[PDB]
Nucleic acid binder design. Structure first.
Ligand SMILES: [K+]
Ligand SMILES: [K+]
Ligand SMILES: [K+]
Ligand SMILES: [K+]
Ligand SMILES: [K+]
Ligand SMILES: [K+]
Ligand SMILES: [K+]
Ligand SMILES: [Mg+2]
Ligand SMILES: [Mg+2]
Ligand SMILES: [Mg+2]
Ligand SMILES: [Mg+2]
Ligand SMILES: [Mg+2]
Ligand SMILES: [Mg+2]
Ligand SMILES: [Mg+2]
Ligand SMILES: [Mg+2]
Ligand SMILES: [Mg+2]
Ligand SMILES: [Mg+2]
Ligand SMILES: [Mg+2]
Ligand SMILES: [Mg+2]
Ligand SMILES: [Mg+2]
Ligand SMILES: [Mg+2]
Ligand SMILES: [Mg+2]
Ligand SMILES: [Mg+2]
Ligand SMILES: [Mg+2]
Ligand SMILES: [Mg+2]
Ligand SMILES: [Mg+2]
Ligand SMILES: [Mg+2]
Ligand SMILES: [Mg+2]
Ligand SMILES: [Mg+2]
Ligand SMILES: [Mg+2]
Ligand SMILES: [Mg+2]
Ligand SMILES: [Mg+2]
Ligand SMILES: [Mg+2]
Ligand SMILES: [Mg+2]
Lengths: 116, 177, 136, 78, 51
RNA sequence: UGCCUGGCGGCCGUAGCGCGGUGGUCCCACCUGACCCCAUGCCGAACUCAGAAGUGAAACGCCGUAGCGCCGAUGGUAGUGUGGGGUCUCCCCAUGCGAGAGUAGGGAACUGCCAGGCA
RNA sequence: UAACGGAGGAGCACGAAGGUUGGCUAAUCCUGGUCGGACAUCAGGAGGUUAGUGCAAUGGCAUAAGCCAGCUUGACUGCGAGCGUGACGGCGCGAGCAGGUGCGAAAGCAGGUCAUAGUGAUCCGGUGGUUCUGAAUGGAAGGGCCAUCGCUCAACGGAUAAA
RNA sequence: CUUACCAACCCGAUGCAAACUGCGAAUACCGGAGAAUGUUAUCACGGGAGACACACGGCGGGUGCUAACGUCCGUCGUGAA
RNA sequence: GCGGGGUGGAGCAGCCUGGUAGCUCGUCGGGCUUACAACCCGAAGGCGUCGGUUCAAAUCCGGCCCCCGCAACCA
RNA sequence: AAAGUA
């Protein structure tokens, strides 16, 4: 099963981040959409979030499942984070390769101000 | 790609009627075709494998993958990790073109051919057949062989039972007996 | 003579023999010979009692042996001093606690089972008693 | 005759060194073990021989956590 | 004990050396690694030599 | 506010299997292509990218159902600390602690944060 | 925690079998398949670690510590809060600090290897280094200090170089 | 076709284990808190030693034959004194 | 008790250290001879007994059996 | 040079 294979791929880095007490930037990617969440160190409270299933973000995009949508979510989640004064996070690729859409989201969040 | 069009424009409705599937994604598909050469003679002369792969490359138009022994076996004098085979996995367009070259050219050139068995199904709708001589494939010049070679052919199908797998292969006129 | 076909280890600590038995019901036949005392049953004893039992019922019915001699017993040979390692395995025993059903019988009348079990008990080093199957 | 046995190795003094609720300084060994019978929790490290040691001052705490019902040792800051 | 001791000599000309072992029958090629030379306080190339 | 879905957690079988049913606006999945970024010790299978015609078939979610797993008393029994006793290889008495197994029974999880769809 | 109690192993291996990043998941059986057989390679299914671990056994291991690949030398140098274990000599675990390094986009990880055997005090000397010493003085010899080498001293806390 | 037949696997039922464990005590041990009691009974450093042949009895065991006023450990008691 | 053994019909190599095992004689067929022997040609024929380890054992390991050689002592 | 027997 594809989802269980990815969850296995993601566990080692997630357990490391929990041990370090880091604030996580979690990314989730589907064929049609991409999602970003900034999660508190306890792992059970979401501080900010942005995705292509939101109207205000998806209205400005031709298609929600490409690198351009990824860059828009990356920038959006960073501005909302800095507005709450968060700044310092750790990137959690959630078992996806650091590449393509996932990388384009990360690059946009770095550019917009998030330190990782 | 011709046989692929044959599948989508005529085989689906034939099977949609014969088995009364409600969804079209229920229709059996041809997932992949895998060719295998068990070259157990390479442990004495590794160059024998280099020719067997050369044939499989010509027959399929794809670089073959040398396969290794999963464990040491005393009965065949092989240690774990010995290269003793070669295989090729065909999917998509290259699959269908080989599927066409096989039914309409290579199979009618079989020694004393009298139809393929219809009991060579594994129980979950996949078909396996053995070719005794590699000369049946026109990409093999009968004059440049150094040794006659067979192979196995497996057609892996997304069917659920043996009856649906034979129905799918029949719709392409698989030369059964 | 019963004896394990193979074992993990050749020799075994002496141990002790406290407690009451497990397996105190007639479970396979209708009549049983139950241990009242505590002790060891050698393989020769188990077999001597089996023979006496079996000849008394004229090899009719069925007989179960509920105990198996799985404990090896070592002995030091004569004129050997103390030390120099554990002795050699000489025979096999089963440890018996009070309540242990040792044999069971079926397919014969109760009067004959009583007589056959009496002849067998005379071969055994432990006090025994005749029991019958109970519904609960 | 003689025996073919008679050998043994020195005892290794493994086991729990600081029990639940004990106050420890950073660096203190909590348990010595072969392999991870106990796993490292918060503020606890796992050495190369799988020794669990305190990474901060505080109180030892044992707990069972996770999907495998594994035993974890952590240090509660005091 | 077939493995033999060898020394890895700094290429920085300081005379500093590390020591290790080597199976000279299976790997006769000279061992070469970049290691920290504490005399010049840099990582440099170190080359196998006799013990 | 209620319903449905996605993500991250708590918890770690009363929560897992099996069997039966059921869902596609959205979401999810399969899916459609691949010159490309990237990829196959062969294969666009997987990873990846560009997409949105089709289908909920598989998967997943939800609902149902004790065929299982799992949980589980009360009482008794085993063991045992202290003191005393006997016929002392083993037990008994006073007092304190008191299982395991089994029985009745329970049981088709519960829950926090954020987001989207619908009413 | 003893016995001339019950059972097995060591006196190594490895410049990758070490570091790191990314990926992966076992045994066994059943069915179908050229030569091909009980057992080779192929395909599907059941199964769920019954495999695997450089070598005994135990404790571990899926976030794998098991399998594959890319790049590499942290198998770094100086130190070390604190702790374990020893009569002692000693032996072990260790965050963190300075310098310099590898892998990773990054958080990070790396001071050898899943861990626990693979060993030998002191003396006497050998080799290289050295801002130390240098018997009137300048040198030198010799000595010190740092790195390293020589023992089945195995009766393994090692009476002698030699029974 | 047939078995004097043998039957592995799986299913059901019954036992056994120092080097078996999907369960699991009593005690013992480590740590914290509190009262009462006890001539500090605790720890550290320093002056002086003796001792390093133990014995039997109870309980838990290895060995021996659940032999020994036997032998070897653990723990308590007394003898030693 | 410590050693060493056990392999074609006989006597004996190989074992050590894992990957089908030899030699002499004997036997069988043919030839030479009036016939036999001698001689010549050609062929055939097998790891004491289990267990274990191992992908694989004549071989390594641990039992058991049969043989051999030393030792089984001081009062 | 080597040729035994009935
Ligand atoms: K199929
Ligand atoms: K359930
Ligand atoms: K490596
Ligand atoms: K590597
Ligand atoms: K002078
Ligand atoms: K000595
Ligand atoms: K005692
Ligand atoms: Mg006991
Ligand atoms: Mg030990
Ligand atoms: Mg796809
Ligand atoms: Mg469905
Ligand atoms: Mg209970
Ligand atoms: Mg259910
Ligand atoms: Mg003591
Ligand atoms: Mg002692
Ligand atoms: Mg990794
Ligand atoms: Mg590794
Ligand atoms: Mg390793
Ligand atoms: Mg190791
Ligand atoms: Mg001298
Ligand atoms: Mg000098
Ligand atoms: Mg001078
Ligand atoms: Mg000594
Ligand atoms: Mg206390
Ligand atoms: Mg003494
Ligand atoms: Mg003494
Ligand atoms: Mg004593
Ligand atoms: Mg006693
Ligand atoms: Mg005793
Ligand atoms: Mg005595
Ligand atoms: Mg006694
Ligand atoms: Mg005295
Ligand atoms: Mg004569
Ligand atoms: Mg004559």
């Amino acid at each position: 099963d594809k989802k269980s294979a990815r969850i296995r791929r993601a566990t080692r880095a997630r357990r490391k981040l929990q041990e370090l007490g880091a604030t996580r930037l979690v990314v989730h990617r589907t064929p049609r959409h991409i999602y970003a969440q900034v999660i508190a160190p306890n792992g059970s409270e979401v501080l900010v979030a942005a995705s292509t299933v939101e109207k205000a973000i998806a209205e400005q995009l031709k298609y929600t499942g490409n690198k351009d949508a990824a860059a828009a979510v990356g920038k959006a989640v960073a501005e909302r984070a800095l507005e709450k004064g968060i700044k310092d996070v750790s990137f959690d690729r959630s078992g996806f390769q650091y590449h393509g859409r996932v990388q384009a989201l990360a690059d946009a969040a770095r550019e917009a101000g998030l330190q990782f | 790609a011709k046989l692929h069009d044959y599948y989508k424009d005529e085989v689906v409705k034939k099977l949609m009627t014969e088995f009364n599937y409600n969804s079209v994604m229920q229709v059996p598909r041809v997932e992949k075709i895998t060719l295998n050469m068990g070259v157990g003679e390479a442990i004495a002369d590794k160059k024998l494998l280099d020719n067997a792969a050369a044939d499989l490359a010509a027959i399929s138009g794809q670089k073959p993958l040398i396969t290794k022994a999963r464990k040491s076996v005393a009965g065949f004098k092989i240690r774990q990790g010995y290269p003793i085979g070669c295989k090729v996995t065909l999917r998509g367009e290259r699959m269908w073109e080989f599927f066409e070259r096989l039914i309409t050219i290579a199979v009618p050139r079989i020694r004393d051919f009298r139809g393929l068995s219809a009991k060579s199904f594994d129980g979950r709708g996949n078909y396996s057949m053995g070719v005794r001589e590699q000369i049946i494939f026109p990409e093999i010049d009968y004059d440049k062989v150094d040794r006659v070679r067979g192979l196995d052919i497996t057609i892996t199908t997304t069917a659920k039972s043996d009856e649906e797998g034979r129905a799918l292969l029949a719709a392409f006129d698989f030369p059964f007996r | 003579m019963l004896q394990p076909k193979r074992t993990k280890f050749r020799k075994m600590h002496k141990g002790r023999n406290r407690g009451l038995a497990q397996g105190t019901d007639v479970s396979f036949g209708s009549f049983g010979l139950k241990a009242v005392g505590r002790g060891r049953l050698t393989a020769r004893q188990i077999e001597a009692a089996r023979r006496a039992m079996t000849r008394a019922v004229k090899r009719q019915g069925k007989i179960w042996i509920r105990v198996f001699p799985d404990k090896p017993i070592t002995e030091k040979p004569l004129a050997v001093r103390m030390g120099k390692g554990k002795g050699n395995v000489e025979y096999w025993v089963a440890l018996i606690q009070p309540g242990k059903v040792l044999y069971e019988m079926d397919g014969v009348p109760e009067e004959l089972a009583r007589e056959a079990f009496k002849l067998a008990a005379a071969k055994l080093p432990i006090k025994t008693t005749f029991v019958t199957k109970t519904v609960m | 005759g003689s025996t073919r046995n008679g050998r043994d190795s020195e005892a290794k003094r493994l086991g729990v060194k600081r029990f639940g609720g004990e106050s420890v300084l950073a660096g203190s060994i909590i348990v010595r073990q072969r392999g991870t019978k106990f796993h490292a929790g918060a503020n606890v490290g796992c050495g190369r021989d799988h020794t669990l040691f305190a990474k901060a001052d505080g109180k030892v705490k044992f707990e069972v956590k996770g999907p495998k019902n594994r035993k974890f040792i952590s240090i509660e800051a005091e | 004990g077939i493995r033999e001791k060898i020394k890895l000599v700094s290429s920085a000309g300081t005379g500093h050396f590390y020591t290790t072992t080597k199976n000279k029958r299976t790997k006769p090629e000279k061992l070469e690694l970049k290691k920290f030379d504490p005399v010049v306080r840099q990582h440099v190339i170190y080359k196998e030599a006799k013990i």
